Design a protein around this nucleic acid. Sequence first.
DNA 1: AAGTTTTTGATAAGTTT
DNA 2: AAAACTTATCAAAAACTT
Length: 188
Amino acid sequence: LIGYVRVSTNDQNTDLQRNALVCAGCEQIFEDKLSGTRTDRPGLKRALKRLQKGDTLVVWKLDRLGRSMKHLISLVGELRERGINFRSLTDSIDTSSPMGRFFFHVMGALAEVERELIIERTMAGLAAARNKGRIGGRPPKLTKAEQEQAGRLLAQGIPRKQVALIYDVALSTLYKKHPAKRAHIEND
DNA sequence: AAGTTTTTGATAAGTTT
DNA sequence: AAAACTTATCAAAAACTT
């Protein structure tokens, strides 16, 4: 019984989603913009607040919409959470009551596969690029010639809280050998 | 742009002469 | 034995790739 509208960037395809619900017999308007960084609902972010947690929702173009990347499915599954579903017209996407709900409930929950295998496709251009031509991981800032260097420092007269200063390693790295000073258990 | 695989690093898990 | 101290968990990372 609600109502929402999406903007792309031009006022050309705005009236397409605007008065698109002009007869949708809604009750509330929710215009917004994307001009900024669409990484934080750059428009009408409180529509989910003052919403009828009991009755259905309203929005129509899942096309031009914030709906993006892997997350577009992650949190959108909050409809089934409260008391709504969907049922626009531009895309008569089967929804509304259980007719669509439990018919497009395994379309967003099973939507895994839609890209769940891209977990392999993506690993293709990587598991291959690997082989012997560039692994693809944090580049070592410490050189092998400078690693074994301390192989005889603190073995002739060098302490601990001093061996590392010109190197400036870390606050957990350094020690990667035999014991040092009593007591155990990590944390970093 | 959703990933790895290495090789990394400031905060939180831990005693007894 | 209280917190010194060397740990083995937790992000961000610079390298890269679908």
